[PDB]
Design a protein around this ligand. Structure first.
Ligand code: OGA
Ligand code: MG
Ligand code: NI
Ligand code: ZN
Length: 331
């Protein structure tokens, strides 16, 4: 069995290997990359996402989210308070202000220590989940707006035609902006490209050990667990690496820098934070290996998780028994 310790693998495809996206994902999995839940892909040196980032300041962040924490430094939840619209140029200036900027630090490790010590005492503003793309239309390789759609994969594998679309999303971050512990909708893959700015640190649990994380989360967030049988779908809970290590939960960490891709694999729980002002683009995707994970994915039916239009068909076809109750949650 390849990669039996479930380490995060880093790949360096040649420009020839960068042509066929599906084939490269299948190659990474042949080497055991999926066992980690997360892989890094460094693009060939000849590749570029677009020519420059000089003209992005007028993008609108319609609903910036202030991420307010509750709990203790290593075990907390966050809620998203909606703020007034602002442009990317206004958000960058905010991120660089004395109130919000990255503090002086020695290296990524020192910054990670400061994040876990002090995150809860601040409420950074995240420009998350903005439909759109920063890939130039002429970028032919690994262009996250030109991938094969999940609906087309389901049709090719299972023979059923369904409604729905699959488009990318932009994330504009600042110091301490945080993504809570989660797997993707319907335990899909994700791919994330860091277009510009400061790094993003990731934590991940191997898919084969995901239920260990869920059992810890039920212990640590006991009221939330009573409220919903899949409350990590709410995407609000954080647990630090120190707490994970104290509780014997297998995990790994890695920092993504500008110009690098990350792939998350089906049922790979992940969480993390931004180092300073940045912009990432991400989208969900599927492969034939996903289908069996989709069929078994947990679902929130309490009503909190509320998700896209296109998830309806995935539930309806892959999880017909759950459909009824899940749809109640969304309606
Ligand atoms: O970048 C972020 O804030 C969160 N991204 C993801 O969870 C992902 O790409 O799957
Ligand atoms: Mg612009
Ligand atoms: Ni994710
Ligand atoms: Zn729920």
């Amino acid at each position: 069995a390849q990669n039996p310790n479930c380490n995060i693998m880093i790949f360096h495809p040649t420009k020839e290997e960068f042509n066929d996206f599906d084939k490269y994902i299948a190659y990474m999995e042949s080497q055991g990359a999926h066992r980690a839940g997360l892989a890094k892909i460094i693009p060939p040196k000849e590749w570029k996402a677009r020519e420059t980032y000089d003209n992005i300041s007028e993008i609108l962040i319609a609903t910036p989210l202030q991420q307010v924490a509750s709990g203790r430094a290593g075990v907390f939840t966050q809620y998203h308070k909606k703020k007034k619209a602002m442009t990317v140029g206004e958000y960058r200036h905010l991120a660089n202000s004395k109130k919000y900027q990255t503090p002086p630090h020695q290296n990524f490790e020192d910054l990670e220590r400061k994040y876990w010590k002090n995150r809860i005492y601040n409420s950074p503003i995240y420009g998350a989940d903005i439909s759109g793309s920063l890939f130039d239309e002429n970028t032919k390789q690994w262009n996250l707006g030109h991938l094969g759609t999940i609906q087309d994969l389901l049709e090719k594998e299972c023979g059923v035609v369904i409604e729905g679309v699959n488009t990318p999303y932009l994330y504009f971050g600042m110091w301490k902006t945080t993504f809570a512990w989660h797997t993707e909708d319907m335990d899909l893959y994700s791919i994330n490209y860091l277009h510009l700015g400061e790094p993003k640190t990731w934590y991940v649990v191997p898919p084969e050990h995901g239920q260990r994380l869920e059992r810890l989360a039920r212990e640590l967030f006991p009221g939330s667990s009573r409220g919903c049988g899949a409350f990590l779908r709410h995407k609000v809970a954080l647990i630090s690496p120190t707490v994970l290590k104290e509780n014997g939960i297998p995990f790994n960490r890695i920092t993504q820098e500008a110009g690098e891709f990350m792939v998350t694999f089906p049922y790979g729980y992940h969480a993390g934070f931004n180092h300073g002002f940045n912009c990432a683009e991400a989208i969900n995707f599927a492969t034939p290996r996903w289908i069996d994970y989709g069929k078994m994915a947990s679902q929130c039916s309490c009503g909190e998780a509320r998700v896209t239009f296109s998830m309806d068909a995935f539930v309806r076809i892959l999880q017909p028994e759950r459909y009824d109750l899940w749809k109640r949650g969304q309606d």
